[PDB]
Amino acid sequence: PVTLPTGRAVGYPFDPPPDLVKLPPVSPMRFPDGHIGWLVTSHAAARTVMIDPRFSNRPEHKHPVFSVIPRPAPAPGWFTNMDAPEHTRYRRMLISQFTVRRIKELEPRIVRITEDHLDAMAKAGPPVDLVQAFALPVPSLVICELLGVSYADHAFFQEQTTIMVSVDKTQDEVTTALGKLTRYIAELVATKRLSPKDDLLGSLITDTDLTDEELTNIALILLVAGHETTANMLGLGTFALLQHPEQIANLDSPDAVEELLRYLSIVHLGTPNRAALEDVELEGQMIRKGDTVAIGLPAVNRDPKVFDEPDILQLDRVDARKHAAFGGGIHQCLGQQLARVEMRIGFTRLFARFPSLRLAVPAEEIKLREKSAAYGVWALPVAWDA
Numbered sequence: 001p002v003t004l005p006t007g008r009a010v011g012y013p014f015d016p017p018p019d020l021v022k023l024p025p026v027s028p029m030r031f032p033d034g035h036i037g038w039l040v041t042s043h044a045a046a047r048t049v050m051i052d053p054r055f056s057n058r059p060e061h062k063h064p065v066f067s068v069i070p071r072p073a074p075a076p077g078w079f080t081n082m083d084a085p086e087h088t089r090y091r092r093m094l095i096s097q098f099t100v101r102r103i104k105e106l107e108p109r110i111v112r113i114t115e116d117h118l119d120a121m122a123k124a125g126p127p128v129d130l131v132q133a134f135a136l137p138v139p140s141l142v143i144c145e146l147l148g149v150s151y152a153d154h155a156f157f158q159e160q161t162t163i164m165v166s167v168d169k170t171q172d173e174v175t176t177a178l179g180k181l182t183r184y185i186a187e188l189v190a191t192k193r194l195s196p197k198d199d200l201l202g203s204l205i206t207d208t209d210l211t212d213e214e215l216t217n218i219a220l221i222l223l224v225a226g227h228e229t230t231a232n233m234l235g236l237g238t239f240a241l242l243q244h245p246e247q248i249a250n251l252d253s254p255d256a257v258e259e260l261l262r263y264l265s266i267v268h269l270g271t272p273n274r275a276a277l278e279d280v281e282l283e284g285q286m287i288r289k290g291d292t293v294a295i296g297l298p299a300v301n302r303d304p305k306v307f308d309e310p311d312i313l314q315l316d317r318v319d320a321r322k323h324a325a326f327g328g329g330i331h332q333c334l335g336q337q338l339a340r341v342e343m344r345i346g347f348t349r350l351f352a353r354f355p356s357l358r359l360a361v362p363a364e365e366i367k368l369r370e371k372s373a374a375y376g377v378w379a380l381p382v383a384w385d386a
């Protein structure tokens with residue numbers, strides 16, 4: 001049984017850990033609590049774990065990949081960790097708000113937010129840390145506007161959300177962060193009950209019978225995911241593009257954002273993971289009832305059975321959309337259309353405004369989020385011809 005692989009090679013910051021990609025498709029894995037379950041690296045096996053009803057996401061059934069659990073049986077509205085049919089009730093309500101119209105109507109504000117941060121970079125002049133100047137705040141402001149949350153408290157949010165998604169923090173640190181967020185959002189929900197708005201949280205209040213508790217947990221989940229996904233793509237994607245400069249000319253390819261998603265696979269440590277409810281055969285192996293199965297997405301997204309030249313970033317490839325960067329099945333990313341728009345706008349406008357963008361330090365000095373559940377760069381010093 002192996003331990004979940006963890007170390008990226010020096011000089012190969014975008015590629016999965018060597019100890020992950022060396023593995024067979026389905027391997028025995030030792031969990032922190034002694035459970036011997038499984039780690040899956042092939043795309044076909046990952047697909048089955050993500051879509052097959054014999055697998056559960058309930059914490060009662062799962063041995064944790066990481067000991068420290070950021071969660072409040074799942075509390076009402078904490079839909080991430082539920083199975084169908086309880087999950088279905090919340091999922092459906094949220095699909096009915098992540099609509100075509102809501103995202104269409106948001107796009108001009110995402111354009112303005114992005115352009116404003118680019119203007120601020122131009123005023124500052126080079127160098128800047130792209131993480132603080134652009135990658136963090138643009139999607140932070142977008143998610144705040146989506147939810148009706150005040151961006152004036154973003155520094156507070158960002159600090160708590162980083163704890164929430166860490167794999168490096170104590171149970172007390174994570175319980176503390178969750179508490180500070182819960183209390184903050186609970187009050188916001190109480191306020192919004194009195195004064196209708198058309199943002200996503202205000203629409204959930206108007207259109208559904210969700211309780212204040214349910215609304216608070218939904219909002220907390222969305223607020224965390226909005227602060228810890230897109231920002232990491234913008235930062236690590238920019239780094240990848242600077243390191244593969246011939247791909248910049250391919251940024252308008254229709255599937256370019258999809259290729260960055262596949263290549264970088266920021267949900268990088270043993271997620272999704274699921275418990276077998278019955279015995280299940282996968283690749284060589286017999287998964288037993290009660291076994292937890294973790295997926296190594298980064299390896300899944302480099303499967304040579306699925307992708308041409310899998311270890312090359314190629315924004316104009318024809319097979320990017322087989323990637324599993326957003327998961328699959330009933331828990332597949334709820335925010336994927338929003339994230340897609342934010343990324344397209346973010347990357348295109350950054351390089352259109354600063355075509356001479358370059359790293360302001362050696363590549364080897366960029367520090368990476370190896371100890372977060374969402375992979376990315378902690379900082380990205382950049383410069384350009386002013």
Ligand code: HEM
Binds near residue numbers: 225273336339
């Ligand atoms: C930017 C890139 C993003 C990536 C790579 C990403 C990735 C993922 C993945 C892999 C999952 C599945 C987890 C699992 O099955 O265990 C997931 C679920 C989810 N994501 Fe995203 N995500 C991104 C952006 C976002 C954004 C912007 C939001 C906005 C709220 C969001 C909200 C969610 C939600 C709520 C779930 C849980 C769905 C459920 O359990 O029904 N994601 N995402």
Ligand SMILES: CC[C@H](C)C(=O)O[C@H]1CCC=C2C=C[C@H](C)[C@H](CC[C@@H]3C[C@@H](O)CC(=O)O3)[C@H]21
Binds near residue numbers: 228229269
């Ligand atoms: C709990 C945070 C949030 C509500 C959530 O579930 O986000 C989930 C679902 C929505 C988006 C996510 C983006 C990044 C990471 C993978 C998180 C899950 C993070 C947790 C952190 C620790 O508990 C260790 C575990 O490996 O992954 C994921």
